Structures are given as C-alpha cells and as structure tokens.
Design a protein around this ligand. Structure first.
Ligand code: PLX
Lengths: 70, 57
C-alpha cells in the first residue's frame, strides 16, 4: 500500500538519472570546448571574438593634395 | 631593403630658362595660354606617377 500510494517504480528514477547524466556530461564537454575556443580566438584573433578596432579606411581622402607626391 | 635608383647627371641636363621671376610674372598669362598642352601633360603625369623619376621627358 505504501509503495502504491507514495512512491513509483525503479524505471522512473533510473531513466531520469540517465537523462540528468546525459545533460550534465554535454554541459561539461561544452564548457571544455568553449574554453579551448576562447584560447584559440584570443591567440590568433581570426574569430568573431576579441576583435579590436582598427582605423576605418573610409576616413582617408583620395584626392589630389596640392603636391603630386602626396 | 633595396637600392634607390636615380637618373644619371646627363639625364638631368636641359636647356634652362634663365629669366627672373619678374619676367615670368609679366609673361605668365600668355605663357599659360600658349604653352598649355605640354604643361598639362607634365602635371597629369606628375600627379599620376607620383614619382619625379617618371616625368623627366
Ligand atoms: C497501519 C497503516 C498506516 C501506516 C502508517 C502510514 C502513515 C504515513 C504518515 C507518514 C507519511 C510520510 C510522507 C508520505 C508522503 C510523501 C509526500 C508525497 O509523496 O505524498 C503525497 C501524499 O501525501 C498526502 O497527500 C499528505 C500526507 C500528510 C500526512 C499528515 C498526517 C498528519 C495529519 C494530522 C492532522 C490531524 C488533524 C488536526 C488536529 C488538530 C503523494 O505523493 P505523490 O507526489 O503522488 O508521489 C508520486 C508517486 N505516486 C504518484 C505513485 C504517488
């Protein structure tokens, strides 16, 4: 009676643990990958992250400058 | 890094205009009216090449 009215079968907890473990393992591997990706992007700078500004080239004036040699 | 090439002294020898700036200013308007084509050729070449060594002739 107690088992019927207060508790559930082993399958529920078993498969819930399976799902929880799967989620947590994915989160762990995601964290490790994210750290490695950050290291690579900060080292090389070829990614979208850690992009530091440079001078905009639309500011350059391309016109004769009173002197042939610029 | 590299050697800067320069024309020889013979390449820079030319029959010079040896009149003073007063004479040049007196003649300037008619000089610009008459001698315009070589002057514009030289100045277009000078702003396009951006190099004195490419404009000597
Ligand atoms: C001899 C026979 C009796 C044996 C003794 C049994 C006495 C049991 C008392 C102790 C109970 C311990 C806790 C049990 C309940 C745990 C919480 C919850 O799980 O229980 C819910 C039920 O709890 C009850 O609704 C409430 C219990 C409250 C007991 C209070 C007792 C004392 C009250 C005294 C009041 C006196 C009147 C006021 C006087 C001033 C149903 O659970 P549920 O989420 O479905 O579980 C999922 C699995 N299912 C679906 C298969 C069930």
């Amino acid at each position: 009676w107690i088992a019927r009215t207060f508790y559930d079968g082993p399958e529920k907890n078993y498969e819930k643990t399976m799902a929880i473990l799967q989620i947590e393992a994915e989160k762990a591997e995601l964290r490790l990958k994210e750290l490695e990706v950050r290291r690579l992007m900060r080292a090389r700078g070829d990614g979208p992250w850690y992009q530091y500004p440079t001078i905009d080239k639309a500011l350059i004036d391309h016109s004769p400058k009173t002197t042939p040699d610029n | 890094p590299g050697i800067v090439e320069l024309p020889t002294l013979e390449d820079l020898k030319v029959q010079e205009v040896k009149v003073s700036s007063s004479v040049l200013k007196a003649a300037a308007h008619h000089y610009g009216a008459q001698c315009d084509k070589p002057n514009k050729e030289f100045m277009l070449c000078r702003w396009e090449e951006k190099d004195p060594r490419r404009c000597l002739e």
